[PDB]
């Protein structure tokens, strides 16, 4: 009843900066070529989408965020041969075109298409599909979840199981893949190995997950808040330390627990100086660490090269180093075969309409993910 | 006729910083258990023993640098079980004790015994076998051969092949092994890639000898001086550039040239400018980034994270990642079966007593590598 029709439906727009969420009537175009129009069923809030709202991260105003979801196409453009009508879906935020070079290689999956890099808010063909109240409206890397509906590029949507539970299956759009992956795919992580996750987030909850997979013998968990470690040992930490408890930097802390420095690190937070030190608290000669979380636009950190020169690797990663549509559905497999779980990462469940509620509680420290139902 | 007697003999003795080095005769001690007197043969000139002159690599002063040799061993101290006194040796600036976790790990090669991390410039019992003027002198990284004669302890110490040149084996000592190594096991340049090199010294040079060897289809060499194009190309470059020849910063140039960015790059200088132009100019999914070049002492560089999220690796090494003890005696013996070539790096030679020339050569930029013989 909809197909080639402009939808009116709910969304939740953000109009500028370090304001709510505005729920409101959206304006949803047909989808064109090559894109897909997709009914959304549940949506992740990620620290991601908080960090459009805080100025952390920069892309253009004003904006449908959300990115970590499921749905179900209500319709597809012209050319489309991936998907069709019917089928649950999880959209990429990361594309995977499969022509360029990145898509191309063996290890890369930060593929050429992406909006990332220079961000610019539109579909592929550099418009948008949205319009509220007369205005255009910006997409948000490709996706903008935060919608009753949303129209995607056919290269940013991969088809997942028919029988997949979506309001769980969600976060293998962003929170779960990205941490797991850093763990397995990026570092590598070794059987008996120890290893040391900085922030206690769904995204490093996942990488705790995703170390005990690999058979890390110790991992452990720093966070500031301590209310995070009674979860993260439930998924697999060994030890919990919280900076703030210490008279002495963290790195020296861990150096010692760790008998000369950790085996992997991993950096789940989005700040500079733990960036550093997450880099420092690993090994000198054979240590790895994998950075994870965003920095705020724009800034630069200061490190001492000599922490290189000594051996260490230090790498970073999108997505956990997951090429997206070949990834997604192969680990929505994986979760419908128990091989691993998400309802740990799952603190609580609203409707969509209380977007606002749920990044309250992301922001006072109380949630790890709330899923948001449509 | 020595053994257990205190030699007296010439070296070099650097009493200050930016001063010419003093050739003087000094006591050397004989060997303690565990340590082994050495009758030195050759040393080439690396840049490393120049920092040590300008104060860019601090280790304790006066001391009797030089690090990059081969000699004779003239005794042994009680226990000794891997070197006899006529043997032919190299020094080995890291040690391998064999026993540290770093030792037991299979890609470890910093070991912990090491004089580099907190210089102490002594030997391992924290005492020094040299006099001069009646002054104790400091040894350097544990080697210190810029004398007729060192005594160094038995971690740091390989046997090697009886009938090889010592006059070439020196640099297998440092320079050679420390490029080579830095492009075939710790970057592990591939068949078909690209690869970039900043820096066309002597290790430098090794490097695009490693990537050629490892089968590169294109090694870009990148220096301000051309007159190190020339010899670049022998050894193996398809390019080289200078970067003063450009309107654009050389990483746009490179990214340009590469179609996207680089497989490996190598900072073969010591500056943080291009430690930083060399992680850029990788390709910033896959790209994989190896810092050779010593950094001035204490300097921190500054860098956008941003560069490591996407995907790029970054590590650094030591002699090439390799396992000193290990691997000296197997590359010496590969060089004597012609698996590399080491004559391409002398472009000089000279006499120990005119070690000041060989000195003023580097610094005019007119030598790859000076050797000195005894
Ligand atoms: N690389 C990628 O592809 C992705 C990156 N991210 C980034 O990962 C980061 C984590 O995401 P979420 O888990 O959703 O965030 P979150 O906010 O739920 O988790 C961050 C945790 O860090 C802790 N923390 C804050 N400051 C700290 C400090 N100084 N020391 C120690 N712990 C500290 C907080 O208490 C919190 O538990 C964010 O920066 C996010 O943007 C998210 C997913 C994708
Ligand atoms: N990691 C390790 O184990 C080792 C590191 N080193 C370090 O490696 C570096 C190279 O050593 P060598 O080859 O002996 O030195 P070198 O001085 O002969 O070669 C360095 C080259 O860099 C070029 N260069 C200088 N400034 C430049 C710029 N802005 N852009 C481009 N090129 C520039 C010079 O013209 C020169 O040809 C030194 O810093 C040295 O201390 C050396 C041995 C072992
Ligand atoms: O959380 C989802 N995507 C992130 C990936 C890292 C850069 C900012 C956006
Ligand atoms: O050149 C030989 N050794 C170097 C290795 C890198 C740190 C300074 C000393
Ligand atoms: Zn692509
Ligand atoms: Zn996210
Ligand atoms: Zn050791
Ligand atoms: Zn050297």
């Given at each position: 009843?909809?197909?080639?029709?402009?939808?009116?439906?709910?969304?939740?727009?953000?109009?500028?900066?370090?304001?709510?969420?505005?729920?409101?009537?959206?304006?949803?175009?047909?989808?064109?070529?090559?894109?897909?129009?997709?009914?959304?069923?549940?949506?992740?809030?990620?620290?991601?989408?908080?960090?459009?709202?805080?100025?952390?991260?920069?892309?253009?105003?004003?904006?449908?965020?959300?990115?970590?979801?499921?749905?179900?196409?209500?319709?597809?453009?012209?050319?489309?041969?991936?998907?069709?009508?019917?089928?649950?879906?999880?959209?990429?935020?990361?594309?995977?075109?499969?022509?360029?070079?990145?898509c191309k290689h063996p290890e890369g999956n930060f593929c050429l298409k992406n909006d990332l890099?220079?961000?610019?808010?539109?579909?592929?063909?550099?418009?948008?599909?949205?319009?509220?109240?007369?205005?255009?409206?910006?997409?948000?890397?490709?996706?903008?979840?935060?919608?009753?509906?949303?129209?995607?590029?056919e290269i940013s949507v991969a088809k997942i199981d028919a029988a997949s539970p979506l309001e769980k299956v969600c976060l293998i759009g962003c929170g779960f893949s990205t941490g797991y992956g850093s763990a397995v795919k990026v570092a590598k992580v070794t059987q008996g190995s120890t290893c040391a996750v900085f922030g206690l987030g769904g995204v490093g909850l996942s990488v705790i997950m995703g170390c005990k997979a690999a058979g890390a013998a110790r991992i452990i968990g720093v966070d500031i808040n301590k209310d995070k470690f009674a979860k993260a040992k439930e998924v697999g930490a060994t030890e919990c330390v919280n900076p703030q408890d210490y008279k002495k930097p963290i790195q020296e802390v861990l150096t010692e627990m760790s008998n000369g420095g950790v085996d992997f690190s991993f950096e789940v937070i989005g700040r500079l100086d733990t960036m550093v030190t997450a880099l420092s608290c690993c090994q000198e000669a054979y240590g790895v660490s994998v950075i994870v979380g965003v920095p705020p636009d724009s800034q630069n950190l200061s490190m001492n090269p000599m922490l290189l020169l000594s051996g260490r690797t230090w790498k970073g990663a999108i997505f956990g180093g997951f090429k997206s549509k070949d990834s997604?559905?192969?680990?929505?497999?994986?979760?419908?075969?128990?091989?691993?779980?998400?309802?740990?990462?799952?603190?609580?469940?609203?409707?969509?309409?209380?977007?606002?509620?749920?990044?309250?509680?992301?922001?006072?420290?109380?949630?790890?993910?709330?899923?948001?139902?449509?």
């Amino acid at each position: 009843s909809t197909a080639g029709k402009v939808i009116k439906c709910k969304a939740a727009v953000l109009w500028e900066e370090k304001k709510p969420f505005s729920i409101e009537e959206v304006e949803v175009a047909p989808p064109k070529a090559h894109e897909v129009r997709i009914k959304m069923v549940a949506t992740g809030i990620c620290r991601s989408d908080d960090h459009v709202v805080s100025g952390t991260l920069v892309t253009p105003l004003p904006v449908i965020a959300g990115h970590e979801a499921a749905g179900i196409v209500e319709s597809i453009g012209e050319g489309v041969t991936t998907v069709r009508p019917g089928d649950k879906v999880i959209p990429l935020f990361t594309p995977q075109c499969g022509k360029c070079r990145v898509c191309k290689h063996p290890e890369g999956n930060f593929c050429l298409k992406n909006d990332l890099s220079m961000p610019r808010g539109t579909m592929q063909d550099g418009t948008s599909r949205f319009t509220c109240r007369g205005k255009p409206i910006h997409h948000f890397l490709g996706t903008s979840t935060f919608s009753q509906y949303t129209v995607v590029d056919e290269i940013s949507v991969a088809k997942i199981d028919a029988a997949s539970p979506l309001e769980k299956v969600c976060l293998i759009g962003c929170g779960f893949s990205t941490g797991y992956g850093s763990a397995v795919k990026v570092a590598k992580v070794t059987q008996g190995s120890t290893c040391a996750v900085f922030g206690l987030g769904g995204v490093g909850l996942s990488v705790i997950m995703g170390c005990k997979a690999a058979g890390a013998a110790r991992i452990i968990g720093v966070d500031i808040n301590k209310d995070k470690f009674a979860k993260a040992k439930e998924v697999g930490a060994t030890e919990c330390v919280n900076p703030q408890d210490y008279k002495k930097p963290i790195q020296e802390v861990l150096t010692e627990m760790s008998n000369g420095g950790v085996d992997f690190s991993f950096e789940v937070i989005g700040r500079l100086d733990t960036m550093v030190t997450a880099l420092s608290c690993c090994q000198e000669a054979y240590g790895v660490s994998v950075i994870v979380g965003v920095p705020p636009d724009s800034q630069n950190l200061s490190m001492n090269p000599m922490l290189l020169l000594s051996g260490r690797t230090w790498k970073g990663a999108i997505f956990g180093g997951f090429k997206s549509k070949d990834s997604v559905p192969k680990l929505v497999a994986d979760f419908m075969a128990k091989k691993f779980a998400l309802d740990p990462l799952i603190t609580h469940v609203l409707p969509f309409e209380k977007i606002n509620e749920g990044f309250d509680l992301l922001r006072s420290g109380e949630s790890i993910r709330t899923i948001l139902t449509f």
